[PDB]
A = this chain, B = another copy of it.
Amino acid sequence: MKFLNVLIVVEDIEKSKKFYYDVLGLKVICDFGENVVLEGNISLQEKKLWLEFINKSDSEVKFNGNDAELYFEEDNFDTFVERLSTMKDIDYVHLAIEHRWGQRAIRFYDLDGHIIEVGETMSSVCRRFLDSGLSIDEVAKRMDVTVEYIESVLELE
């Protein structure tokens, strides 16, 4: 038992590939035509074909259920967010939020109602805290996590 791929169903493979490339900078790493795999092992699957695979009528496949999300982290968070703001027809789920543990993140939909969240890298949230004057033990408490955790994220930035 090994988890390998998250598959998302899309209406149009070429448009989604473009959306993920223009917006997230995600490129293809494997192509089967009707099923393409993006960096991170995110598989895009064409709907019509999908219907045959799982044997469900077109009515049995709903989108925008808001029941899951693809989660990403970006080193240059601000620049990404601000580039995202210059773009048109970006369907945001909500305004940019700040998680309980200090991490800024934004959430928007792809072309098919699938939620994408991209937030600051955890290691950068820590460093932000460590520079405002907090001790490492304090930071660990501030974020409801152990000092072990913080040290593993720090030596990876």
Contacts and interface: CB of A to CB of B under 8 A. Distances in A.
Given A55-B94, A80-B1, A107-B54, A7 B65 contact: no
Nearest to A93: B54
A102 interface: no
A16 interface: no
Interface stretch (A68-76, A124-132, A133-141): A68-76
In the assembly, how many copies of this chain are there? 2
B72 A67 contact: no
A85 interface: no
A73 to B, nearest CB: 5
A66 B43 CA distance: 15
Given A1-B26, A26-B1, A73-B2, A7 B55 contact: no
Contacts of A5: 70-71
B4 A72 contact: yes
A71 B8 contact: no
A112 B67 CA distance: 9
25 contacts: A1-B118, A2-B73, A2-B74, A3-B39, A3-B40, A3-B70, A4-B73, A5-B70, A7-B68, A7-B117, A8-B68, A9-B67, A54-B66, A54-B93, A54-B94, A56-B66, A61-B66, A62-B64, A62-B65, A62-B66, A63-B65, A63-B67, A64-B65, A67-B113, A68-B114
